[PDB]
A paper describes a structure:
LEA was engineered to represent the evolutionary node that acquired the unique ability to photoconvert from the ancestral green fluorescent protein (ALL-GFP), which was engineered on the basis of ancestral gene reconstruction from the great star coral Montastraea cavernosa. Perhaps the most important mutation to make LEA photoconvertible is modifying the chromophore to a His-Tyr-Gly (HYG) chromophore, making it a Kaede-type FP. Another green-to-red pcFP named the least-evolved ancestor (LEA) was also discovered to display pronounced photoswitching of both the green and red forms. Several photoconversion mechanisms have been proposed for the Kaede-like pcFPs, and most mechanisms involve a β-elimination reaction and backbone breakage to extend the conjugation between Gly64 and His62 that forms the red chromophore, although the complete photocycle remains largely unanswered.
To round out the set of related FPs, a new FP with a novel chromophore via ncAA incorporation is presented as LEA-H62X, wherein X = 3-methyl-histidine. A rather surprising finding is that the 3-methyl-histidine (3 mH)-bearing chromophore in LEA-H62X leads to pronounced on→off photoswitching (orange), where the GB absorption peak exhibits a large intensity decrease after 2 hours of 505 nm illumination, significantly more than LEA, together with a large increase in the GA’ population. The ncAA incorporation of an extra methyl group to the chromophore histidine ring greatly reduces the photoconversion efficiency versus LEA and the LEA-A69T mutant, but surprisingly enhances the dynamic photoswitching under 505 nm irradiation which can result in a larger red yield and red:green contrast under dual illumination than traditional 400 nm irradiation of LEA-H62X. LEA-A69T crystallized in space group P212121 with a full tetramer in the asymmetric unit, while LEA-H62X crystallized in I222 with a single protomer per asymmetric unit; both crystal forms were described previously for LEA. However, the local environment surrounding the P-ring of LEA and LEA-H62X are essentially indistinguishable; therefore, the blueshifted absorption of LEA-H62X likely stems from the slightly twisted structure that results in a reduced conjugation between the P- and I-rings, consistent with the blueshift according to the particle-in-a-box principle. Regarding the drastic change to the photoswitching behavior under 505 nm irradiation, the pre-twisted P-ring of LEA-H62X may enable the substantially more efficient on→off photoswitching than LEA. The extra methyl group causes the largest horizontal shift of the imidazole ring in LEA-H62X relative to LEA, with LEA-A69T lying between them. The distance between Glu211 and the α -carbon comprising the bridge between the I-ring and His62 is 3.7 Å in LEA-H62X versus 3.5 Å in LEA.
Numbering used by the authors:
A (entry chain A), B (entry chain A), C (entry chain A), D (entry chain A): 5 to 63, 65 to 219
Write the structure that this text describes.
Amino acid sequence: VIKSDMKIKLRMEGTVNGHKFVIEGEGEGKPYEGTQTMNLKVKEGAPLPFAYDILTTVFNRVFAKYPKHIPDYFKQSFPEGYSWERSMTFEDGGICTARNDITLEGDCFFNEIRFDGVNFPPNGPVMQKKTLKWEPSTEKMYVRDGVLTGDINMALLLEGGGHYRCDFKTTYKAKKGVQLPDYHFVDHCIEILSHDKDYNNVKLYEHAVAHSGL
Amino acid sequence: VIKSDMKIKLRMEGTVNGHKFVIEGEGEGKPYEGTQTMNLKVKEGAPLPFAYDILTTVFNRVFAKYPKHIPDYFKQSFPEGYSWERSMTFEDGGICTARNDITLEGDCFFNEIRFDGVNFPPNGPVMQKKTLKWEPSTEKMYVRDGVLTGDINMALLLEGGGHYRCDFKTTYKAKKGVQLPDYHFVDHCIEILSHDKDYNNVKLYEHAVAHSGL
Amino acid sequence: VIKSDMKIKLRMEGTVNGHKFVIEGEGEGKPYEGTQTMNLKVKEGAPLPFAYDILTTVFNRVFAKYPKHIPDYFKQSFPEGYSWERSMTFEDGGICTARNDITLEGDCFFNEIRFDGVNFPPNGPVMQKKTLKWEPSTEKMYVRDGVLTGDINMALLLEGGGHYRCDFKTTYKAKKGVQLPDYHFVDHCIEILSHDKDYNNVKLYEHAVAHSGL
Amino acid sequence: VIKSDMKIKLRMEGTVNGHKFVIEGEGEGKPYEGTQTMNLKVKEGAPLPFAYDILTTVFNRVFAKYPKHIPDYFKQSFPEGYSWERSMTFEDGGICTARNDITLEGDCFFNEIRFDGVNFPPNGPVMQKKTLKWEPSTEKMYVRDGVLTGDINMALLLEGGGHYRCDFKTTYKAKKGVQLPDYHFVDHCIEILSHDKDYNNVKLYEHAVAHSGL
């Protein structure tokens, strides 16, 4: 079922700072190379009044290169699939919650996403769209009460330089029992490859690689 | 417009641990006495698989007794009204986001509520419904970048005794400029007066009183 | 042993931002009225390069008015006495740890204090001495694994107005078993009554009152 | 001054849970290979009543392999040297503060260390010595207001399996201006190579490597 080439369909509905929106996406990736590319269209709530970058890491750890010696929680989870929940705690008190329900129909991953952001200061970098990109990162993966937890120290590079910090916690729940991995890492980088004026259209790329550290 | 007796209508839509639900409520309160009572019906997602108590403080600081010497951000905000956003950070990593858009039509407050909870441990008190009540509390109210912020150290009393701690941050945004108060407190207590087996029906009561501390 | 009038002797040794100091104090209070006054002298590390206010709440919950219906963990702890540990988490990442070992010799409380502060931004209000006072507060008191825990949402009023937030957690350990109270509150206010140029000399006052909330 | 082979002398004084101790160490490392080994003796407060592992990462980022393309804040700081401050926020509310003042005399780094830990639950893994090791980690390094900040998601592996999480923030201050690096990573692993019954004697090893991520 998980082939060397898979397609991806997604719908996100969300509210940030009380602003409602819908974004749909279509793309493709190489699960075994840990790469994926997606084309995202704002369907409702254009133009977004917040930094598009807060959304991009919510737009599937199936797209991560897992070595033999590390059990692949994500790939083992299919065909049944899995869901995740995430909190994003920004250093200025902005908080987001997000979830994705991931299903497999043929060679296509369907992603049903909800995103909610609250308490962004009105003159902070998110509401004033001062973000350039996410720096690369390393997710710390560990089992807690029988499900996979990922913690990340994430940072947005700001216009003018310097960084806006965010702590991620993701809980990943396979819909069937799998071989649980030991403590390990997933390196990430995520890049907006192109966008129009108000990010109504966005081409998004991720590379991810699992490893056991030093 | 804000009389000694007002009615309240609400709809909450939410997702906790991936479980979708809708709850509607009707009730009444005394804004100047800082009291209110509400009758809540689960409309979708019965029976709730999580502790109903995580919802109750999301089900309007108009219902708080404000003394003369403290400017009433909430009552001054009408007829135009106000909205709030809240993060609830539980000590075991459970996080909720919530928002309420409050409008005034005649003597009735309409409440449009969204609630989302993530990362509740499956064997924690919320997913195992081990909560008895919220302890009383004191909200710390202060202006930050021109809007009212409230911080609360909240605690749920547990079955077996001892407490489950939650930190609230609420940002309150009047839809028109008002007299901003100085740093002050709002004492709260919130009580489920009655409920059926699975909290399909709930009668809920709050008392709230603003003060300037010692 | 705990009379209506008691004396207080203290020595604090500490390091903030790498700056070492020693402060000694002598004063007096009314345990049953929940009041105390103290005279503090900087003995080493004058002039302090940080906001003196970060120290003042570390300079004994014996000085709190406890009503009959709330068991007094502190007063019950003597003659043997008690110790406490505290973390102070400031909203800009400044963190302090502090401890006090409290003994009773005659009508005098001896206080052996250690205070350590790290990660204060060099252009933040603590290192630029922009604090005016602590706002009043309400400490939430609860038992956790057999010892009394206090949580406080504290705020320093800043020069220019607006607030610098700090979260306190104190663990209070009686040196003998006592009647553990139920969940309750202690209202505080703390005031620098007078000081010289660089706070080499400071007269400090606290009022504290325990209550059961609404 | 920073040769391919350097010696290390250290003294830590600290208090955890009110327990006072002094630990001295002597060792050696390869700054350009990012390796170091140290022999630590408890001089006061034997036997330690807490998990020795909370101390080991406080026992100098000079011992990290820095590639050409990343400015070496640490090595550039000598001969004048640098100091750091650290907060360690454990997931059960245990908090430590630590600092190190690092000087260079000949081929020897001198380390003047203070460590303070508070609010460790009495039946938690630190006070019940249930820790096996620190998992490897990746420190996120970024400049904030002109000094180097490092954030780490750290985890102790527990007896019985599963993990105890700790968030590190270190502020690193060179005693002279240097070439500030861009956002980057330092991979770490730290290992107790050997110890006696109560960790009165400990041989400690670290490997560290700076990189720019994916």
